[PDB]
Design a protein around this ligand. Structure first.
Ligand code: HEB
Ligand code: HEB
Ligand code: NA
Ligand code: NA
Ligand code: NA
Ligand code: NA
Lengths: 710, 710
């Protein structure tokens, strides 16, 4: 018996299950990154021999390997499912999930029941990854595989961008839902459904371990109309509308098949549950043949089209021109099969083309026929295949690139020149202007420190690294819907914008550059007022985006309904305010020390929403000192709960109320890690370290979206 | 509802509770460290004004604070308990626990029931920490507080060393035991006791959340003789023998008291369980007065001596010259109280000295009277107090410094010049010698690569960063007990030592420097044989320790009974081999990427214990290439379990056995994180990166104990 906490069950986590999960802020660090510290994937991938890659990947599609042979000699359907599943984890509420990090090769996603046998697909890509090496991330490779499969099977894809950097462990920040079992029906303890089958809000799948919906029907009970409702809901939470959804569904099932020819109970554990002999793979059948015609994956069995190795118009020919009834696959799954199909329409056996097998549709396919709105789009696609192929190709491109962020991050020869609106386009901003002049006019305006700092904070605080949307580039805070969001304090904002817009006209700097410069000036002034002189570093070049290139509705999701950094809460949510602060801070890409210095700094700058004094533990607001920490850590005070999210900080001797504070303020003096950082910053010797760390964190946030640089 | 995994309950941990806990290798990294990257505590603490510190800390002892007032105006007893508990977590089997990192200010230890109200003690030290700042770690401050309390109450302490660096989160690598509740009796599911009340082996306390033993008796049932047995056992696992144990116990209880005057059920949650109003503190009584005479801590109530604010000979006067019986404290705890004590021996009330209260002894104190072996030592101490005070002072110093490592790490003016044997002393080795000459004679000997590398690996692999014992400095591998350990292959070792000892005599380099240089030469040769030229970096100066300064028995604990790095297992243990590898790697201070490249490199060097070919996936053993990874990741093979800790790696086409392998080898191709690293190192473009990373990891291990440098 050794003393190491050597398995994941052994931790502090079990004793206090409600503690802040601060580890989510210290992921993807030096000790897990096996690359050198100056390795830069973007420069390496710019040197990738893409034409040779394209060729190898095309050849892989008809290069069957004996340990997991290709259906009909063609891996295309499998590779498309790979890429679709990689990308189908994305959700709009927080931007988390998607294909942008290569996450499918790690827990939990490598072992979701919906990703069954995608472990075979990934592994089949290894010889390619091995060949191209550090110039081809696993993330880009996984995202690309299905696009090349489409090209090889006859579809004109819209394009492709490289630029996704690999990670080296699971994304600990992603909450995938409340369940403690895989794929439970919504009539379960810990259900993700509330009220009238309303899906809990960040979530974009109908249950734990599925991509979107249950292909056998809602909670496993076929009904195309109820299935349609889930499809509409989930796909909407993955940024897709009805037309995109029907296109994706039909275009997906234009190729490939369902695998369910055997007994599912004979499959070995999923990959994270399997033992070492399985080579990182899972769902292996050691009892009988689990490969080729005997593959079991979803448990449904059949292909949607007569020719599943090729792009064609088989999908709607089959769906719409045959009548369908419910049947059970050999593995016991519900599926739809057509009534009296013709021989010549039967897909052949995957190993022997002289045997005919069956056609199928899932409950989600039948939803495309029975939902009245989908039926119309389906008819359009049956009538107008050129439109079908163009809508699908664009949707497939959107699917696989929706978390890539600004076009500045896109690399390679098949990047579309078009600026799609879901890329939140922003032009390059002028960089030849005198920065000092802009600064002097900001200083010469009569806008306070408070006005300047809050406005810059609010412009940048929308950034989220999950899908790389938001941030200060573009000055979308001056457009709808941002300029009217309650948390942005639209009056104060309009007042500042009037001034700063005039300064930008006068100077030839973008409004975006000026908003940020202005925040810098407020910080510089507050430091100066503590007798400290610095110039904050500054990168010009931000563009101002137009309303035309700003999809008002897609921005709903970036609204700051909470921001602990300005002691802001729009309503009294379920989550604790400090959990909300942790979430926002993780999206911003900030560490726990960074979060800490920002909070202390913003507080003494006087930047709370509504001009509240909660957490403003200073006699000199507007002056940049470590007062917040000095006072938070002083045991001459006691802390008295005083209603919702509010405390009285009281002098122990006089029993008088000296300040007030929220839970967001006080967690920095309560949580044992955070108080340790608070104490560091409250040391007599750490005043300048505080200012310096504050400034660095401020700058990091201001620059977070600046992929146009770097 | 936000999408962030914002509480510690939400993780991958619950789905696969048996996965390797690789996070323990990536702790204490840049994103949690709030200090600058060139901050070096050792240089800062060398500038600390220690005399002024001593004075402030002495003054703190009689500087009562109203929110937790000092007993009789003196915090000494509290401060000694602090420091004792900080240090009493240490255990010898793995070196983990102790006062060396300041761990008491973080979960779980900040919230153990045994650390009740030590949150008050730590907090009382804050004004000091605030004053001295980055030059005084919390770890050093906590370790020092009790030593200064002793000085102030009249004991001549033996000394003190600064040099413990702060950490910023819990020590995730420490397995504290199997229980899921605090302080369950050993008749529980998940018990730490096996067989005839045998304590499971790394563990050094009788239950979860205690320091050593239950002060009310075994599982709460008073019996001094059974208590004695636990005391002997636990203290032995904390490196203390009978004399040290009686001394510590009596010297501890010469001052201070037990607090149990109230109702324990009225205490608020422990700190990690408390809400934000409690300022990071815990066990707060909001129902009645929980301070001063009304303090409740252990639930026992009374002082061991008449004058608990002073060092004196009260302990054995009381214990031995009164007869004792069992009674219940006001909080309901069992305690021993004397029969017919005199008034003048009654400790006074902690607030009002004109009221007399009671004397007490715990079941562990009565063990010092009733255990026949302890009784004799107790009589010696009653008879010879000068000897008592000297043994206690030394033991207290040992207690608080046992995890500090070599004397090279000790800093400050009260460091004892004596070399204590538990410091594993090693002299400075000569550094003026021609390195190249030594190398040429190593090369000119006929020792193989295999011999050279294994011998250097085995010399260094004993290091553990938990208590900083072991490592290649000192060449203790050539002494008892090391030279005869089975895992060290004593014949092969003796053969190499003969040669290298001759080289060291000839050259004036220590045997220790030569063992390491020799390993370097084997690596250099293996690289050369792949047509790669490097000189490995090399730091001379290792000393050769003597047998006189080597406590044979204390080294039992560093024996390599398992080492995955040489595919070594001494017997077929409960833990999986790969969990054992993870444990060893954590003690070595290595990251997961480092662990990975080492394994692949050692395998192809031909360094397995017993000359086994398990994991030796090369046709060119002795040549330093990435073959291990290339072959591990090649799906032309399948992997067949073949008995205990063994697999056949078989060609899929011929169905023939190409190599064999252990679980230690194969986890690098099975675990999803490890295989990701294996794939990186198997890329066509990463051969040199592999050699380079291997070399850096090798060097890190060779230099791990070199605190005499740096
Ligand atoms: C775009 C793309 C896509 C999309 C979106 C989709 C959408 C979908 N999907 Fe899909 N899928 C697909 C594409 C797809 N898909 C493919 C390609 C496949 C095939 C695979 C193979 O062949 O292998 C599938 C397959 C499949 C399957 C089978 C699997 C196996 O193998 O068994 C299923 C169940 C499904 C379902 C589904 C659903 C429910 C949905 C909803 C809506 N799919
Ligand atoms: C060295 C040192 C030391 C040592 C080793 C010890 C050892 C011991 N111990 Fe101790 N303790 C102590 C020192 C000590 N100690 C002190 C100082 C005190 C007091 C605190 C005050 O005064 O506050 C105590 C206290 C105590 C108490 C009470 C707490 C309260 O407050 O309530 C108890 C129960 C105990 C037990 C014990 C035991 C069972 C043991 C075993 C053996 N302790
Ligand atoms: Na994302
Ligand atoms: Na087709
Ligand atoms: Na330790
Ligand atoms: Na005393």
């Amino acid at each position: 018996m050794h003393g190491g906490a050597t398995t994941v069950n052994i931790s502090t986590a079990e004793w206090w299950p409600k503690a802040l999960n601060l580890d989510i802020l210290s992921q993807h660090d030096r000790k897990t990154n096996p690359m050198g510290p100056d390795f830069n994937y973007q420069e390496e991938v710019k040197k990738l021999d893409v034409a040779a890659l394209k060729q190898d990947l095309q050849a892989l599609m008809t290069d069957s390997q004996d340990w997991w042979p290709a259906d009909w000699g063609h891996y295309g359907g499998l590779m498309i499912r790979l890429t679709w599943h990689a990308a189908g984890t994305y959700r709009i509420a927080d931007g988390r999930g998607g294909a942008g990090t290569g996450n499918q090769r790690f827990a939990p996603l490598n072992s979701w029941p919906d990703n069954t046998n995608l472990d075979k697909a990934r592994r089949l890509l290894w010889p390619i990854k091995q060949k191209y090496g550090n110039k081809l991330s696993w993330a880009d490779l996984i995202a690309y595989a299905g696009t090349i499969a489409y090209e090889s099977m006859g579809l004109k894809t819209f394009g492709f961008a490289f630029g996704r950097e690999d990670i080296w462990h699971p994304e600990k920040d992603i909450y995938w839902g409340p369940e403690k079992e895989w794929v439970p029906p919504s009539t379960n303890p810990n259900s993700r459904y509330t009220g009238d089958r309303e899906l809990e809000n960040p979530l974009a799948a109908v249950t734990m371990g599925l991509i979107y919906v249950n292909p056998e029907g809602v909670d496993g009970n076929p009904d195309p109309l109820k299935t349609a409702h889930d499809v509409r809901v989930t796909f909407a939470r993955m940024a897709m509308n009805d037309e995109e959804t029907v296109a994706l569904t039909a275009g997906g099932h234009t190729v490939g098949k369902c695998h369910g020819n055997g007994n599912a109970a004979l499959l070995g554990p999923e990959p994270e549950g399997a033992d070492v002999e399985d080579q990182g793979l899972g769902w292996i059948n050691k009892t009988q043949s689990g490969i080729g015609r005997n593959a079991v994956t979803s448990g449904l069995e059949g292909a949607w089209t007569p020719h599943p190795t090729q792009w064609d118009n088989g999908y709607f020919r089959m769906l719409l021109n045959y009548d369908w009834e419910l049947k059970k696959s050999p593995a016991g799954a519900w599926q739809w099969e057509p009534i009296n199909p013709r021989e010549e329409d039967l897909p052949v056996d995957v190993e022997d083309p002289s045997i005919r097998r069956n056609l199928v549709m899932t409950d989600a396919d039948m939803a495309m026929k029975m939902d009245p709105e989908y039926r119309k789009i389906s008819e359009r696609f049956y009538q107008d295949p050129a439109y079908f192929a163009d809508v699908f190709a664009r949707a497939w491109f959107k699917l696989t690139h929706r978390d890539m962020g600004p076009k500045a991050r896109y690399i390679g020869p098949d990047v579309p020149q078009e600026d799609l609106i879901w890329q939140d386009p922003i032009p390059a901003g002028n960089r030849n202007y005198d920065v000092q002049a802009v600064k002097d006019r900001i200083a010469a305006s009569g806008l306070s420190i408070s006005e300047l700092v809050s406005t810059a904070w609010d412009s940048a605080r929308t950034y989220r690294n999950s899908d790389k949307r938001g941030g200060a580039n573009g000055a979308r805070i001056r457009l709808a819907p941002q300029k009217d969001w309650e948390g942005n304090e639209p009056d104060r904002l309009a007042k500042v914008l009037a001034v700063l817009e005039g300064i930008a006209a006068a100077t030839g700097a973008s409004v975006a550059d000026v908003i940020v410069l202005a925040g810098n000036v407020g910080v510089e002034q507050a430091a100066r007022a503590a007798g400290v002189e610095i110039v904050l570093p500054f990168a010009p070049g931000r563009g101002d985006a137009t309303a035309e290139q700003t999809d008002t509705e897609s921005f709903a999701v970036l609204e700051p309904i909470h921001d602990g950094y300005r002691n802001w809460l729009k309503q009294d949510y379920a989550a604790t305010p400090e959990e909300l602060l942790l979430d926002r801070t993780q999206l911003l890409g900030l560490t726990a020390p960074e979060m800490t210095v920002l909070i202390g700094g913003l507080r003494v700058l006087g930047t709370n929403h509504g001009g509240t004094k909660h957490g403003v533990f200073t006699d000199r607001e507007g002056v940049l000192t470590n007062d917040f920490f000095v006072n938070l850590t002083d045991m001459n005070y006691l802390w008295k709960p005083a209603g919702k999210n509010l405390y009285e900080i009281c002098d122990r001797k006089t029993n008088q109320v000296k300040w007030t504070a929220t839970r967001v303020d006080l967690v920095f003096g309560s949580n044992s890690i955070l108080r340790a950082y608070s104490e560091l910053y409250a040391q007599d010797d750490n005043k300048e370290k505080f200012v310096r760390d504050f400034v660095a964190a401020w700058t990091k946030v201001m620059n977070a979206d600046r992929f146009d640089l770097d």
